[PDB]
Each structure stands twice: as structure tokens, then as C-alpha cells.
Amino acid sequence: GPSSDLYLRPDSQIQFTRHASDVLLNLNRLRSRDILTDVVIVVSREQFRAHKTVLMACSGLFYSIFTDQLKRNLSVINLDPEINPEGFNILLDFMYTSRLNLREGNIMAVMATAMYLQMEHVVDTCRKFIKASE
Amino acid sequence: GPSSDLYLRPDSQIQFTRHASDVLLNLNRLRSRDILTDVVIVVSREQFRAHKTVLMACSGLFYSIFTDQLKRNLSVINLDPEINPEGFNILLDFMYTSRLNLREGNIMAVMATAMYLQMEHVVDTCRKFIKAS
């Protein structure tokens, strides 16, 4: 036969199984390079730069604050004076990395911070972790 | 002994293995509600809303746009007229879902769009896909 048809012959879907992790790593790299951060969270005078979208993604508190259309343009938020700056820094790193770093001596701080930010799945994991101790 | 010490005795790290997927799904839900979407992409006839942060995460093109000093506070972007809105739509869904949907009839459009957005890993996966057909 004198002819042939060069046709792409598969309706397919390609699933990129590490895409979500790749995105979060890039969101974290933006944060650390201060690229497109749009809020400063201040905890007992300590300043933390962040992306609002990642905050509402992980935290019921920030979800509730920023789904308020009037409060959506806040650029500096001071947490309640009770909150521990170190606990907050640990949860923020969690949001951007999936790792929750605990030292012997700060679990209660981390848990309480997580209860304030309304991160219940983290609280539950802290509850299990505590019971693996006392 | 009359006493005892109830002390939390662990330097540990908890790794939440689906947290990254959970975040991406929530970014998609926020996008679907126009919550904190801050750029409108205009592709010929059609307009698309997105988070500049997600666009910069996935596309070398948008990363260059939004780290450009003058061009960082842009709120509406018009793509080159050559770009097909259906191709862009497939790649935007990819950014927010990890799923790349290819139909017979749009493979070339998807690939060309991805070359334009400088999404080289997708272009490579599309190249593999084409070769199997």
C-alpha cells in the first residue's frame, strides 16, 4: 500500500503522583525568599511572613478570618497574647512542609497553639503522641 | 515511694504523608470559590482566575512574570493570541489537581501550551505519551 496515517492513537489522564508535594515545596521556597508573601503574623512581637492561601488551607482560624471579605486585605495580624511564638513557628513550618517538629519539652506548646489555630487533625496526632509518653 | 513524675518523655518529628495533597485540594477549593484569586489570565475569548503563587509554583513563565519587579502587581494578564484556551484550561486543572487530562484532538494543544508556560516536565511527559502513539 502506498500510504500510511501517522495518528496519535490512545482519552487519557496522566496522574503526577508527586505534583502536590512539588507544589508545597515551591510554596515554601517562595515564602523563604519572601516572594509574594502577603501577610505578617506577629506573635509576642515576633514577625512571621506567610501566604494567606496556605494559612486558610491549614487552619480553621485563618480560614475564618480571611473568608471575611472585609478582613481579607489585612497585612499584619497579631495573635492572642497567650500564644507561644515557638509553637506557632512549628505549626507554620508544618503547613509548608508536612513535618511537625517536636522537642522533648515543647509538645504542650505545639498542641495549644494548634488548638488555637483550630488544626484539629494535628491536635489529634498530638494527643496520640502525648499518650505514647504519658 | 510516695511520689511520681508524670512527664512527657520523648526530639521527634511527625511526617504527615498526605498533607501536601490535602493542601493542594484546599487550594483548588479556594480557587473554585474565587477566594484570594488575584490574577485573571485572558486567553483569547476566555478568562481564567488563579493564585499567582500557584501559577509561579508550576510555570516558569509566570514565575518570571511575577518576580519581574514592575510586573509583580499585575492583576490581568493577556496571553499570546496563539495560545488555545482549551489547552490552557487543561494545564490550569493540572496545577491544582495533579491530573493531566488528554483527549484525542487536544494533545498537540496541551503540549504547545505547556511549552509556552515553560512547563518542561509536562512537555516531557507529553513527549513520552505521543511516542506511545
Partner: peptide
């Protein structure tokens, strides 16, 4: 037809 790709999906923004 679903196909699983397991390599890096997007550019990696450098530190």
C-alpha cells in the same frame, strides 16, 4: 485510561 507519572512534575524554585 489513567497513567501514573512519578517524576518531578514542575520546576523546582531554588533556595
Amino acid at each position: 485510561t489513567t497513567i501514573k507519572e512519578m517524576g518531578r512534575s514542575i520546576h523546582e524554585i531554588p533556595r
